[PDB]
């Protein structure tokens, strides 16, 4: 499930929600993985 299942209200930030989801996960890999590189 990706780019579709949004916890927050899409009304407020539909496009911002999708990106926010993935962006949030980056924090996990940022501690031990790729992160943003």
Curated annotation (Swiss-Prot):
GO biological process: one example: defense response to bacterium
Protein keywords: Antibiotic, Antimicrobial, Bacteriocin, Disulfide bond, Plasmid, Secreted
Primary residence: secreted
Disulfide bonds: 9-14
GO terms under cellular component: extracellular region
Subcellular location: Secreted
Chain's role: Inhibits a wide spectrum of lactic acid bacteria.
Family affiliation: Belongs to the bacteriocin class IIA/YGNGV family.
Protein name as catalogued: Bacteriocin leucocin-A
Origin species: Leuconostoc gelidum
Part of the whole protein covered: 25 to 61 of 61
């Amino acid at each position: 499930k990706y780019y579709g299942n949004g916890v927050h209200s899409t009304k407020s930030g539909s496009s911002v929600n999708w990106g926010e989801a993935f962006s949030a996960g980056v924090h996990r890999l940022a501690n031990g993985g790729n992160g943003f590189w």
